[PDB]
């Protein structure tokens, strides 16, 4: 109990007025945590498309898309980082129980999506790819995020992904946001002397 004489931690339910006369419990509250269930698909006045569902898949690369581990104590992503979940299933393990991961993606790519999303005003779900990394054509079958784009498990794929004729053929691409490409990184050993003064 509490000093007033009410129970200290009484069980409680979050309830909403469903269409017409129904009281449907949107969610339930257990202990400290707040359980919110999206019982109604739209909180809007009856429109369904809303922001188009845009499940997006990405992969981690620095600086552009950085996966960071969220504070355990400071629950859930903090500030700028946006959540990205991949079911953490040991691929090797046959069971491969997959619980979506809780690592927060953040960076230039994420920031661009965040900025573009506001103008677009379409809500979206973000997760991480498991198989194939950057899209790859091996034998007769593609791999990576492109697979989830083809399987329609991803509508749009975001990342450090480069552009090529094959992928432009299979899927429409956005205009490029950063000048990049193939390049070399080396150590510069020495300088040449010419007596020409």
């Amino acid at each position: 109990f509490s000093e007033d004489g009410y129970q200290m931690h009484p069980k409680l339910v979050i309830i909403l007025l469903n269409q017409e006369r129904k009281w449907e419990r949107v969610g339930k509250y257990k202990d400290r945590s707040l359980k919110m269930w999206p019982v109604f698909d739209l909180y809007p006045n009856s429109e369904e498309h809303k922001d188009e569902h845009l499940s997006i898949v990405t992969l981690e690369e620095a600086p552009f898309v950085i996966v960071e581990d969220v504070d355990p104590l400071s629950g859930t992503c903090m500030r700028n980082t946006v959540p990205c979940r991949k079911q953490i299933r040991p691929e090797n393990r046959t069971e491969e129980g997959g619980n979506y991961i809780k690592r927060c993606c953040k960076g230039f790519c994420i920031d661009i999506l965040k900025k573009i999303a506001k103008t677009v005003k379409f809500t979206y779900d973000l997760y991480l790819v498991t198989n194939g990394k950057h899209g790859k054509k091996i034998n007769g079958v593609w791999n990576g995020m492109i697979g989830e784009v083809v399987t329609k498990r991803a509508y749009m794929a975001v990342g450090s992904l480069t552009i090529n004729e094959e992928r432009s053929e299979v899927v429409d691409f956005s205009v490029p946001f950063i000048e990049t490409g193939i390049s070399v990184m080396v150590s510069r050993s020495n300088g040449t002397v010419s007596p020409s003064a």
Binding site: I163, N164, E165, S168, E169, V175, P176, E179
Partner: protein, 51 residues
Amino acid sequence: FEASQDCDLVTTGELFFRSGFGIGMRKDSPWKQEVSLNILKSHENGFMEEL
């Protein structure tokens, strides 16, 4: 290119407002996509680069 051409004149600072060069055509051109693939190839084969 002009900066090279004279050298009496110079370019300074850091390029701002970066942009890509792409052909302009009237909408719905059924070729623009192919063109895009073609110039893509021009980059891929080093043609664009060679030029």
